[PDB]
Design a protein around this ligand. Structure first.
Ligand SMILES: CCCCCCCCCCCCCCCCCC(=O)OC[C@H](COP(=O)([O-])OC[C@H](O)COP(=O)([O-])OC[C@H](COC(=O)CCCCCCCCCCCCCCCCC)OC(=O)CCCCCCCCCCCCCCCCC)OC(=O)CCCCCCCCCCCCCCCCC
Lengths: 57, 63
């Protein structure tokens, strides 16, 4: 009673019901480094300008 | 000009220039620390964007 599969069927993506758990870390990776602190707050003007040797702006 | 005017104008000049000098010293120290530690926004030399990585199931499983 076995029916030979048609053209296209064996290449389908099927779904699988399992009882084993999903791996929480399959790559066995450690914790990532914390990123650098971002920018926050309003952008104030430069205090007394460029501060380049004698330029007041 | 009055001696009062020259005097207090000198005090305003001295405040502005001493604030600029203290800010330049703090600027040098901030640059030295950020180059040494790499944890600020300056001297952030680029690395690879991790958004380029394909995370799809590949042709072989051991990857
Ligand atoms: C209600 C809305 C409207 C309101 C309107 C209000 C205004 C109404 C009036 C309208 C006109 C305003 C004009 C600008 C404001 C005055 C700017 C000023 O004098 O700054 C003083 C500035 C600093 O003095 P201060 O007492 O601390 O500040 C007074 C104010 O608070 C100055 O304020 P500050 O402290 O905020 O200034 C910021 C900063 C203050 O400056 C600094 O922080 C110091 C650093 C300045 C530059 C130093 C460079 C050093 C190496 C180069 C040397 C140059 C060689 C000399 C010239 C060679 C021949 C041209 O300026 C700069 O960094 C800009 C560079 C200098 C340009 C100044 C403006 C020039 C406009 C016309 C240009 C014509 C040629 C001029 C000569 C060319 C060289 C300047 O003086 C100098 O540096 C001395 C050099 C001469 C400056 C130019 C004088 C402008 C008038 C020229 C008229 C005659 C022209 C003759 C023919 C052409 C030449 C042969």
């Amino acid at each position: 009673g076995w029916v030979r599969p048609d053209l296209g069927e064996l290449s389908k993506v099927t779904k699988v019901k399992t009882d084993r758990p999903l791996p929480e870390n399959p790559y066995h990776s450690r914790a990532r480094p914390e990123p650098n602190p971002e920018v926050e707050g309003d952008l104030k003007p430069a205090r007394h300008g460029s501060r380049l040797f004698f330029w007041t702006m | 000009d009055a001696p009062e005017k020259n005097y207090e104008r000198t005090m305003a000049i001295l405040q502005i220039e001493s604030e600029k000098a203290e800010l330049r010293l703090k600027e040098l120290e901030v640059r030295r620390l950020m180059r040494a530690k790499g944890d600020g926004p300056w001297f952030q030399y680029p690395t690879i964007d991790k958004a380029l990585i394909d995370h799809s199931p590949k042709a072989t499983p051991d990857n």
